[PDB]
Amino acid sequence: PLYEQLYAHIKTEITEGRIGYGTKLPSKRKLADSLKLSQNTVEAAYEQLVAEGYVEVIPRKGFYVQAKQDTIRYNFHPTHIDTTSFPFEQWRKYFKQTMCKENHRLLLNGDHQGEASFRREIAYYLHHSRGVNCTPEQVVVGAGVETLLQQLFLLLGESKVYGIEDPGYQLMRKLLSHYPNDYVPFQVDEEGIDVDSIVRTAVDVVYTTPSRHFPYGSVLSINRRKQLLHWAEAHENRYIIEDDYDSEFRYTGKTIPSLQSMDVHNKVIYLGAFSKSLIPSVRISYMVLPAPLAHLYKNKFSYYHSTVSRIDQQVLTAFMKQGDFEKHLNRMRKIYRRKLEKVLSLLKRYEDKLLIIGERSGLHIVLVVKNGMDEQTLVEKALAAKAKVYPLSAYSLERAIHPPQIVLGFGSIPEDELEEAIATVLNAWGF
Amino acid sequence: ELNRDLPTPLYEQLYAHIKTEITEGRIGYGTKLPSKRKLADSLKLSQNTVEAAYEQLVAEGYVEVIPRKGFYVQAYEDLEYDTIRYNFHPTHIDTTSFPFEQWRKYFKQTMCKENHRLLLNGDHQGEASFRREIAYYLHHSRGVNCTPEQVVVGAGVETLLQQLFLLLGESKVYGIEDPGYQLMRKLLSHYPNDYVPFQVDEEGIDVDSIVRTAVDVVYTTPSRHFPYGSVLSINRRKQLLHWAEAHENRYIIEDDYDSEFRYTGKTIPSLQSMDVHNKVIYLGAFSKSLIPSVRISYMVLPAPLAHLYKNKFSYYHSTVSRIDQQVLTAFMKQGDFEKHLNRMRKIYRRKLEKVLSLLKRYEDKLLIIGERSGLHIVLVVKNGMDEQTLVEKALAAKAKVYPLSAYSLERAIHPPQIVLGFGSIPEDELEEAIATVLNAWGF
DNA sequence: CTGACCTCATCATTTTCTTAAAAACTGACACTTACAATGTGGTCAGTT
DNA sequence: ACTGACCACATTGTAAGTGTCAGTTTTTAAGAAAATGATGAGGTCAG
């Protein structure tokens, strides 16, 4: 339009320098007549110019110029949950129920921790499922476990030591790489972590997964748990973090109570996750904190907002306020149990070479290969067979184990393709 | 003793009994259990339930079984040892004008049974679609020149700023605007880094003080200055760009607050447009325009800093859900964003004109410092009373207001100056709101 | 030989799953009205 | 005499609206049917 065409047509002379600073622009009320353009167009162009300060105007009118991967048939790892059996038509029914024109004032942020209903529901569910004592005020909610962990890191300080078990999930190493703190490895036997090693050391906060040990699946006894609680009881400024990795997926023996139940003097914090059950890409997590530390955190981090969208909070609290969470959880448990039974029975024949180690509960198995080939050749053959696999040597930074044990997960593989996938992998290995 | 009437099966009551007997201390270390047959006969129960309870006990660790022999306890216990009627933020966006029924259609179009293989996460940089449409929108609305692969996505501005802080280092010295938007100081209050406060006049940041000091990175808004609405001139922009160019380890960050709501003067080109030396990083927002509660944002980087960010944070995962990301990609793909933006622009212009015209009459004791563009206006009360008394009297009539005392490190003017916003006040209530607040005050 | 590891059988109560018709829904083309955009023309107060 | 800003009214065309319709979708009380806690009677193998 001419409205800004004149603006550009004159801006070219101010920028290029047809007239220097202080020189008058061609005219006022006369340039319009000479160019035949209407006066209003000139007025608009000059106002646009003085908006950006290309030309400065004296109060009385004078013009002062200014100077994942592309080709994979399959992939194996415990991260990928199964996705086909998600009841979309049950999610949409609550979504269209929660976001309606009538219900405004849910589009603006508030309750910096999270929606009060969501916190109350989480407290009730945790207390009546995992035996975890809690309070509605006690819980905090954020998006991704990473943000909660970084909040904890900034809350504690840069003057503490962290204990990470060597065969484990490569998270705390990657977080502590950036931060000043340093980590101390710890080996783990078939009954738990080397609590004797910890009590023979001056570590302060240690990262453990009592319910199920990634990836070997070992379950901590009561004696070692009691010893660890007494170890935390000794001093006044030591804390133990409990990670709820993959509970509620145990088949035979119900499920094991969480370590937070044993806490009586407030030295255990309950960390959890929410995106390895419902959706891998919905990004909700949660955390509980002991009364003094939670009170301090409330008094310390007032100015942050929530991190996960309020829409998701409301829709999901309405989703599992009615009770569909139990139904979905049970259906997933059944399908995963059947998948695991089929895979184990299929692989049972090659028992001389493949010793399955671990326990049934979980979403994955770890298998040791007694063949003479090297693990690099194994993974390269798997990828060259259009079915990539993820070895365990990356999950532990110590010396590579001579028997190359390769991790296998099956959440991604469809129920009807399990046998074909296993057959293709084993044919690739040359059996 | 045993009810048999509780919903929990004997498969659990037997466990409860044995657990309380072991933990109370009536069975010691290494003691023999009655195995399966004897206990099953004595308790007139099936073998299956007994073996299930015993195997479950073994799994949790109380007792250990040696094959073809009896159980043996492995559990030696030492036991322990008032009523806000009219909100006033210069941050709220209107709710009623929001087309929900256009959101719903895209939501139902994107998430279906066929659309699996999307619940699984990935591409923490953001799927190439969302990036390419956001880059195209920025290029054709703000004159910003950057390929799609530079941009990133994160949940809000705070997370992006924390990632940038970790990426750059703790040795730098940061610069902020005048007493104003209280974000960077609140973030740096927890980090070793330090900030150098500044003063700005009615035209913009004093670039001379910048060039006479050795600050490393300085934070300011080229398009609209919170809360005075000042616009930086071309001369000061050029001088700031030269100052950033002068050294080789100094960066300028650009934060456009509401640079798309300029009513008359089209859209002022963004500072990134003039950068040819690759020294500015763009910071935007999707939450001061569309929804203030979905928590989305975006940010742009130059090529070497892009490589550094790629090599440094390659093992994170985005905090923005793929559901919202894809549905909003579809939202802007067909052009509905422009229509929504225009509608909001027009309604906000009407609201501003109405409120200004209403406030015109009482010009004797009050003034208007803010300019036309923006979502809020700054006024001074020349009544002989302190700001805190005005705020508490505002509370006294169930209509609270938020002054500039918290915004200001110093004391600007003894006659209090107070910020008012109108994002969440309906059109047919502005007159009543202003009337009741003026009644609460001396007028 | 009594002692203890184990695998099927088939019984039961109470939760999950499937099919139809009857309900409310919302995309597609259509058209009737607006309405704020630029734009021209002709004013205005008050300087100097 | 040189130039502040405030009306008129003209135009194109995007946005705003009600209309009946063809059309995918949602709700319901059945129906049926999977699964588990439970009783039974066995399989081998040791010492």
Side-chain angles (χ1 to χ4, degrees):
Chain A
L2 263 182
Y3 179 98
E4 311 174 5
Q5 195 278 332
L6 184 56
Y7 161 70
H9 187 199
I10 190 167
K11 194 271 291 183
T12 189
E13 289 99 10
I14 294 90
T15 300
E16 278 303 328
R18 174 201 270 211
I19 52 169
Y21 61 95
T23 317
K24 305 287 105 175
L25 302 179
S27 279
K28 180 67 177 177
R29 190 167 300 168
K30 164 184 175 59
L31 73 165
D33 306 336
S34 52
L35 271 299
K36 170 56 202 83
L37 282 72
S38 175
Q39 171 261 290
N40 196 298
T41 300
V42 162
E43 168 196 6
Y46 277 6
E47 199 192 2
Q48 182 67 77
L49 285 164
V50 304
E52 287 173 20
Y54 263 101
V55 298
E56 272 169 1
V57 65
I58 295 90
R60 186 47 190 210
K61 292 301 166 182
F63 290 148
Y64 183 75
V65 185
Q66 293 332 288
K68 285 262 211 203
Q69 285 309 130
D70 307 315
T71 57
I72 51 170
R73 311 228 203 179
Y74 317 85
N75 57 4
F76 292 109
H77 47 293
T79 300
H80 283 184
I81 207 173
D82 197 9
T83 182
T84 65
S85 184
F86 187 27
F88 307 92
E89 285 80 358
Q90 195 59 256
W91 194 233
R92 286 191 270 180
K93 183 253 189 178
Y94 290 96
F95 181 73
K96 308 191 306 181
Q97 185 163 110
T98 187
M99 183 177 177
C100 60
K101 184 292 191 193
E102 179 273 298
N103 191 359
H104 47 282
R105 75 190 37 100
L106 288 199
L107 294 164
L108 60 90
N109 44 287
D111 291 331
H112 301 285
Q113 316 211 60
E115 278 284 325
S117 172
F118 190 64
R119 282 151 41 205
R120 280 151 36 173
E121 185 276 343
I122 283 182
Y124 182 76
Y125 155 72
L126 276 181
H127 169 274
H128 279 94
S129 184
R130 308 301 311 293
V132 189
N133 276 270
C134 278
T135 300
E137 302 173 355
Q138 196 96 15
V139 57
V140 302
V141 59
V145 67
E146 302 171 334
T147 298
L148 270 298
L149 276 195
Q150 289 185 357
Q151 281 194 357
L152 211 53
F153 283 179
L154 267 62
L155 182 52
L156 288 189
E158 63 185 342
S159 64
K160 278 190 181 303
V161 291
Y162 284 139
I164 176 170
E165 52 193 2
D166 189 358
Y169 183 75
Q170 46 196 5
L171 199 153
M172 221 75 88
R173 180 182 182 272
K174 302 310 179 60
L175 270 192
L176 286 183
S177 177
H178 303 331
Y179 288 60
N181 295 75
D182 44 356
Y183 59 95
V184 286
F186 276 94
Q187 293 289 342
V188 292
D189 59 67
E190 196 66 28
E191 191 176 2
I193 64 179
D194 308 338
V195 182
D196 308 339
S197 292
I198 292 171
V199 69
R200 295 279 76 77
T201 311
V203 303
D204 194 14
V205 161
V206 57
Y207 164 64
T208 192
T209 75
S211 277
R212 172 177 185 265
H213 186 283
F214 196 114
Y216 284 158
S218 66
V219 181
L220 269 77
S221 66
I222 184 170
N223 280 326
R224 283 192 166 176
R225 286 183 179 186
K226 215 67 168 289
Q227 175 174 322
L228 198 68
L229 266 293
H230 303 143
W231 169 98
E233 184 54 271
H235 202 260
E236 194 265 328
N237 273 1
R238 307 190 256 203
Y239 287 134
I240 174 64
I241 69 173
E242 173 170 7
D243 187 8
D244 187 2
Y245 162 55
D246 194 69
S247 303
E248 305 277 23
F249 274 27
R250 179 169 178 80
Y251 318 142
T252 64
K254 322 170 59 179
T255 190
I256 58 174
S258 296
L259 192 152
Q260 213 274 351
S261 64
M262 290 274 187
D263 193 346
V264 188
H265 290 281
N266 296 115
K267 280 73 176 175
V268 176
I269 70 172
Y270 200 113
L271 186 148
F274 209 100
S275 191
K276 218 162 294 208
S277 297
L278 287 196
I279 297 89
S281 177
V282 65
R283 293 288 184 265
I284 295 92
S285 296
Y286 62 103
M287 185 180 288
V288 189
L289 301 180
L293 190 152
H295 196 76
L296 188 153
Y297 172 85
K298 184 218 310 183
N299 259 344
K300 182 74 183 298
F301 270 41
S302 179
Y303 64 92
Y304 291 168
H305 297 296
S306 43
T307 317
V308 64
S309 64
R310 197 151 153 198
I311 295 304
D312 286 330
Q313 288 190 18
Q314 279 292 350
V315 67
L316 190 151
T317 187
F319 172 94
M320 65 182 179
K321 183 47 207 83
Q322 316 280 30
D324 307 353
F325 207 72
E326 284 85 352
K327 305 178 187 296
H328 174 232
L329 184 63
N330 288 343
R331 173 162 72 262
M332 311 305 327
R333 179 194 308 188
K334 299 299 186 292
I335 182 164
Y336 291 139
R337 171 207 294 249
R338 165 159 68 258
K339 283 194 171 188
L340 178 57
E341 297 295 335
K342 185 175 303 201
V343 176
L344 186 59
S345 297
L346 167 57
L347 265 191
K348 197 201 222 182
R349 40 187 294 179
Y350 306 103
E351 185 69 9
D352 66 326
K353 304 292 183 65
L354 277 296
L355 294 174
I356 301 301
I357 190 167
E359 184 177 1
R360 310 308 225 287
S361 314
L363 280 76
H364 66 89
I365 57 175
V366 62
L367 61 83
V368 288
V369 174
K370 284 142 191 293
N371 192 31
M373 295 298 102
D374 56 80
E375 73 290 339
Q376 187 274 334
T377 295
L378 301 203
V379 181
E380 199 271 352
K381 283 322 202 84
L383 181 58
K386 315 301 220 163
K388 173 165 75 159
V389 73
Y390 296 155
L392 188 65
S393 61
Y395 286 68
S396 174
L397 73 164
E398 71 172 351
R399 43 176 168 89
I401 319 295
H402 181 276
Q405 43 189 349
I406 299 193
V407 184
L408 275 193
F410 35 58
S412 174
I413 299 306
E415 195 157 10
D416 282 339
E417 294 172 15
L418 267 176
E419 184 174 359
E420 177 65 21
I422 294 293
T424 49
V425 166
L426 272 299
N427 191 307
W429 283 356
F431 279 23
Chain B
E1 300 179 358
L2 279 76
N3 290 138
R4 175 74 92 96
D5 293 331
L6 275 76
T8 56
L10 277 296
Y11 164 86
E12 192 285 339
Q13 284 99 26
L14 191 57
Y15 178 75
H17 192 84
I18 190 166
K19 179 172 75 175
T20 188
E21 295 288 355
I22 291 173
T23 50
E24 196 275 332
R26 294 200 252 278
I27 301 169
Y29 191 105
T31 313
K32 274 302 221 163
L33 276 297
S35 182
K36 294 195 214 169
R37 280 77 175 272
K38 283 134 187 181
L39 188 66
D41 302 357
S42 62
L43 294 174
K44 56 199 168 294
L45 302 190
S46 306
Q47 178 180 183
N48 193 8
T49 183
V50 162
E51 71 177 0
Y54 272 129
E55 190 277 331
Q56 188 274 331
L57 275 153
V58 165
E60 286 150 314
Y62 291 168
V63 70
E64 157 67 12
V65 65
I66 59 175
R68 305 188 180 284
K69 284 63 141 173
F71 305 125
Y72 288 99
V73 180
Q74 275 193 349
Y76 52 97
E77 293 83 3
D78 50 353
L79 277 297
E80 301 292 335
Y81 51 82
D82 287 342
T83 60
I84 61 175
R85 195 83 64 84
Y86 282 135
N87 73 104
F88 286 130
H89 288 172
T91 60
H92 294 169
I93 315 301
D94 186 74
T95 71
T96 63
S97 64
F98 185 15
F100 316 98
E101 278 79 3
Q102 184 74 1
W103 195 241
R104 287 187 186 182
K105 175 198 165 184
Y106 287 109
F107 186 96
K108 299 219 312 290
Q109 175 149 346
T110 183
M111 181 195 208
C112 66
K113 276 183 156 118
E114 180 65 27
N115 224 27
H116 75 83
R117 183 207 31 70
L118 186 137
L119 298 173
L120 59 87
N121 44 28
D123 286 331
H124 65 279
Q125 195 78 6
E127 311 86 298
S129 190
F130 187 99
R131 291 194 323 173
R132 82 182 66 257
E133 285 85 5
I134 205 173
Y136 212 79
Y137 154 66
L138 271 182
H139 171 276
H140 274 288
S141 188
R142 305 307 308 284
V144 188
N145 196 337
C146 57
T147 55
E149 62 263 20
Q150 283 81 18
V151 73
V152 308
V153 294
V157 65
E158 309 157 355
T159 298
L160 284 171
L161 275 196
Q162 290 194 210
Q163 292 190 21
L164 183 66
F165 281 9
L166 261 63
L167 166 66
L168 287 189
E170 294 177 350
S171 65
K172 304 302 198 69
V173 176
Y174 275 126
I176 75 170
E177 73 201 359
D178 72 330
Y181 194 12
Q182 294 277 257
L183 177 64
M184 208 154 268
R185 62 158 288 197
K186 290 304 189 58
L187 294 174
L188 288 169
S189 173
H190 293 112
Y191 296 175
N193 299 69
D194 57 29
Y195 68 101
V196 174
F198 266 69
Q199 286 297 112
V200 303
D201 58 356
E202 307 289 333
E203 210 275 324
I205 57 183
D206 49 351
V207 188
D208 59 358
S209 300
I210 290 279
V211 307
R212 299 292 179 90
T213 309
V215 289
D216 290 324
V217 173
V218 61
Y219 168 62
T220 193
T221 69
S223 292
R224 177 182 189 270
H225 184 284
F226 201 112
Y228 285 156
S230 296
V231 175
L232 277 74
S233 52
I234 190 167
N235 305 0
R236 290 204 164 181
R237 284 179 177 192
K238 264 288 172 53
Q239 187 173 1
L240 203 60
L241 191 144
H242 290 135
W243 170 91
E245 154 66 16
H247 210 266
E248 280 80 13
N249 189 359
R250 286 184 306 196
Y251 281 142
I252 187 65
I253 68 188
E254 174 170 22
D255 173 12
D256 54 338
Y257 174 21
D258 283 11
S259 176
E260 212 81 18
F261 284 7
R262 167 66 56 172
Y263 305 145
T264 63
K266 64 157 290 181
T267 61
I268 297 89
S270 178
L271 172 56
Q272 217 276 346
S273 162
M274 294 182 286
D275 189 3
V276 183
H277 292 357
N278 320 119
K279 297 307 290 213
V280 65
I281 57 178
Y282 202 113
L283 191 153
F286 269 62
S287 178
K288 211 50 110 338
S289 172
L290 188 153
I291 297 169
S293 184
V294 176
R295 314 257 67 102
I296 321 296
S297 292
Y298 64 93
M299 183 278 288
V300 181
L301 295 169
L305 195 58
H307 286 172
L308 259 64
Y309 185 89
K310 179 201 64 50
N311 268 347
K312 192 48 160 47
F313 292 166
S314 173
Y315 283 30
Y316 283 166
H317 280 139
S318 274
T319 312
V320 63
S321 54
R322 291 194 80 172
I323 304 307
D324 291 333
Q325 190 161 349
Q326 262 295 336
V327 70
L328 195 145
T329 300
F331 197 99
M332 64 183 73
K333 176 57 179 68
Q334 274 145 190
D336 191 280
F337 197 62
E338 282 156 20
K339 299 180 181 180
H340 170 68
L341 194 64
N342 288 20
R343 183 194 308 112
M344 307 288 326
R345 171 197 302 190
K346 289 197 292 186
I347 176 64
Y348 279 135
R349 181 199 295 185
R350 176 194 323 157
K351 279 191 168 193
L352 170 76
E353 300 293 340
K354 205 152 268 191
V355 64
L356 194 46
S357 302
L358 179 48
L359 215 51
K360 172 63 67 65
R361 204 268 179 196
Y362 285 146
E363 206 88 6
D364 49 354
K365 317 292 186 304
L366 283 72
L367 294 174
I368 301 299
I369 308 186
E371 282 188 33
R372 52 174 61 186
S373 179
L375 274 64
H376 55 93
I377 56 150
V378 285
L379 62 85
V380 297
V381 169
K382 278 166 183 167
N383 192 31
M385 182 55 58
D386 67 82
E387 50 186 352
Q388 297 266 20
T389 306
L390 311 193
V391 176
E392 67 88 9
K393 298 293 183 182
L395 188 153
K398 314 303 218 190
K400 279 189 276 189
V401 74
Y402 303 140
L404 207 76
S405 79
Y407 270 90
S408 60
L409 292 86
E410 321 161 359
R411 316 284 91 72
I413 287 177
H414 165 83
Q417 74 177 243
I418 302 184
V419 178
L420 292 175
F422 49 87
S424 180
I425 307 299
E427 286 150 282
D428 44 357
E429 297 181 354
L430 281 168
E431 60 91 18
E432 176 79 349
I434 291 173
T436 187
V437 72
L438 268 294
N439 287 315
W441 293 353
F443 301 85

